[PDB]
Amino acid sequence: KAIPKDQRATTPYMTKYERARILGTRALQISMNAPVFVDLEGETDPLRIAMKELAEKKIPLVIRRYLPDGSFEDWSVEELIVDL
């Protein structure tokens, strides 16, 4: 039921799961001829590209982490600290 960008108690870090699904969804779009936001310095494999987009923080996605009570927090991929 929405939670202000402030008062977020959830981890600043990306979960292995979040990352896995983000790399999976994004790779699906790349494989379907969807535009890429990172300079393709050779890479051709969609996932390999998706990963490059994650590092350079150019994936316009948002994770809606729901809490067991129904409420939820909204974190942007860009915002999430990636270290797994």
The number of beta carbons lying within 10 Å of the beta carbon of residue 30 is 20
**11 versus 31: smaller Cβ distance to other proteins:** 11
Q: Is 82 in the site for other proteins (CB under 8 A)?
A: no
Task: Out of 11, 25, 31, 71, point to the residue binding other proteins (CB under 8 A).
Answer: 71
C-alpha–C-alpha distance, residues 81 and 74, integer Å: 14
Dist CA 42 CA 53 (whole Å):
14
Does 68 interact with other proteins (rule: CB under 8 A)? yes
Provide the binding-site residues for other proteins, judged by CB under 8 A.
Answer: 67-69, 71
